Design a protein around this ligand. Structure first.
Ligand SMILES: Nc1nc2[nH]cnc2c(=O)[nH]1
Ligand SMILES: Nc1nc2[nH]cnc2c(=O)[nH]1
Ligand SMILES: Nc1nc2[nH]cnc2c(=O)[nH]1
Lengths: 288, 288, 288
């Protein structure tokens, strides 16, 4: 919304289109440490956020912030390596800008990935959690990417989000995990978005737990919301990079070298899993 | 606050006053589908938000956004048909502007109405819920209409809200429902304001439930707060237009054609009920 | 962050330094009614917020808003009498500005004090609560003082806050309370920051209770967060000035004359307690 006008999304979509032979069907948003997925593309055309018109450039990253087009396991993709977060200063209408243009490019599905902390006791670090639902803490307070006058050309005023995370895709995902003969199971739960850049206190770790959250993070939710408003099929995963909740002798506290989640090894596992699912995402062709 | 200065409220009050023979004692804010209450006025003087000076115009509505003066069942009213919401972009000091000017017009009571979703299991759609209390989610985070320097000419710095919804008015309301010989009872509970324009996920529907909320909505609370700061008697109702909370087979999801709450029929029931209560609201005359 | 640049904190630190013979080791932030602690200083050099460069002046206070340097029970202090709150309009990067400059002055410890309402049933007004942890409601929604690009010269991007309130200092504080032979014990619990200037409804008083909060307030948390990001040892107390949570016959409601907490008497008790603890805060000298 604000700051951006429809023609803005229009000019950015047309520009990209006229600058790439590619026409994407699936946009993929890589979470921290899941950018290597871009290595899995064939015929990649890399665009630096900066080159792309109204596209929000990176506050610091950049060189870990690019939009790369290609083909992944059957599908025509567009991967955003290095996503925007509101903790970096971007208003939510800049953070979710990409999604609006992906819609105008022709994208019909959005797989969003992220790194998150483990709230559910079952979860072990390294785990992967299929996002079945979410709790939008910023949104309850006004920080919803849809705020402002609504463009009925994109969507409705009051979109429902109870059915956000595609049921089929999540079923097919659970099945694909099994068909791969995977040992540690594909977990599943509610992701709670929290804004601030600092990590949580035990007291905070307990309210999110009490609220029903399984993994906590600082992104995804805004993009899921504007994806859905546009009518995109959405599904995502969370790479549990850590976990906490004990005043009673924390013995640790986290920082960032912790948010690696077995680094390469565990990240590679999501990257291939995600690539395997390209086959399981419906062709626009109708494929009947 | 911000954007508005006292003389602004002053000029808007004086202008309206000098433009209307009417001097209101009760301001009524109509929720979605409760604008027909304006049909119940006698000697209506209709002002388009736009004509009124510093008055925030409607982002899209307008022609469902007007301030109409008149008499309703004994009382001298001023009804706002088409209220402002923060999900439309209005900062909370624009959303609650009317209340500040109604105070300067002479208003001493404010009946606020709204449409809300049912969180309490008891509630059936079509129901009416007497607002006994509220949970201000945006306010916990900073989105409180009172934020900014405080004008002691309007009120205190730290107004108490534990006694927001007038006890007497709510008693008289419960009684009036019974005197009307009403079948389905007048429900009563805590209203939780949530900002974002999109509707809630099941996971979100469960935190609001856990927090103690009975009906969820996206307005009222900001206006109740600035009404009280001014010293106005406040009371309101919620037209339960829908209800949800089940990951375990939602089978539905809502949108907006759902938020009708038996449309006309149920809305008419609140509109007359509200008109009947004009008799039950104390005359400034002291009436002793 | 925003609005302020590093050189800004730099110029304000150097200016103060060049304007005071003093070099502080402990910054103390006085809560409502705890400003008399400034009376306990020796060799005080008082600076009006206004005189100090980029320093946010007071929205109304001022004459209850000053930065006074001196010595308190062994330590070289800098006390902020009259702290900034976001309910007054200050963006969180103005509210927490002092802390950033105190860091540049040489401060290594920050004792923050505040007045709060009692959520825990045990607490009696007049009580003092050692802040062992907190729940940052504004931060969950985006209102975190660290938001914006991160200055690695001050700290990391994702600072941990699970270990915010210094364990040792809190142990030494508990001990000092006992060594003083104090009757009513030094309480301890989780402080929940809430923004809005108005006070809470019973319904709101119950969510904070359910969330695990022991005392509710409208400050401290933002400053604790930026203090920690800088690497400062932080510890604080809360003067329980009141308490509520009963729809079922509130019988009272609060306002501000209530937030006195036995005024002088109870405030004096925290002021001396705080002064006694100067001895218990480690000299930068290493003191080995
Ligand atoms: N807020 C938050 N975000 C995370 N991202 C990865 N781990 C965490 C965590 O523990 N907390
Ligand atoms: N947030 C919200 N607002 C509503 N207004 C009417 N129904 C609803 C609902 O289900 N949710
Ligand atoms: N929010 C809030 N702040 C306080 N500060 C002192 N008492 C209170 C209280 O009851 N509520």
């Amino acid at each position: 919304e604000n700051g951006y006008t429809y023609e803005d999304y229009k000019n950015t979509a047309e520009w990209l289109l006229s600058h790439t032979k590619h026409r994407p069907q699936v946009a993929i948003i890589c979470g921290s440490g899941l950018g290597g997925l871009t290595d899995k593309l064939t015929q990649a055309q890399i665009f630096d956020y900066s080159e792309i018109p109204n596209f929000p450039r990176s506050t610091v990253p950049g060189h870990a912030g690019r939009l790369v087009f290609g083909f992944l396991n059957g599908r025509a993709c567009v991967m955003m390596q290095g996503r925007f977060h509101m903790y970096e200063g971007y208003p939510l209408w800049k953070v979710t800008f990409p999604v609006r243009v992906f819609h105008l490019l022709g994208v019909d599905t959005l797989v969003v990935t992220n790194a998150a902390g483990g709230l559910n006791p079952k979860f072990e670090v390294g785990d992967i959690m299929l996002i079945r639902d979410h709790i939008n803490l910023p949104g309850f307070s006004g920080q919803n990417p849809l705020r402002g006058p609504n463009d009925e050309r994109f969507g409705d005023r009051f979109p429902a989000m109870s059915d956000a995370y595609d049921r089929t895709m999540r079923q097919r995902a659970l099945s694909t995990w099994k068909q791969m003969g995977e040992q540690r199971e594909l977990q599943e739960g509610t992701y709670v978005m929290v804004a601030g850049p600092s990590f949580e206190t035990v007291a905070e770790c307990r309210v999110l737990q009490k609220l029903g959250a399984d993994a906590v993070g600082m992104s995804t939710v805004p993009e899921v919301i504007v994806a859905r408003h546009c009518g995109l099929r959405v599904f995502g995963f969370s790479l549990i990079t850590n976990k906490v909740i004990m005043d009673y002798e924390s013995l640790e506290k986290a920082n960032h070298e912790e948010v690696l989640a077995a680094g390469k090894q565990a990240a590679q596992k999501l990257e291939q899993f995600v690539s395997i699912l390209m086959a399981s995402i419906p062709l626009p062709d109708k494929a009947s």
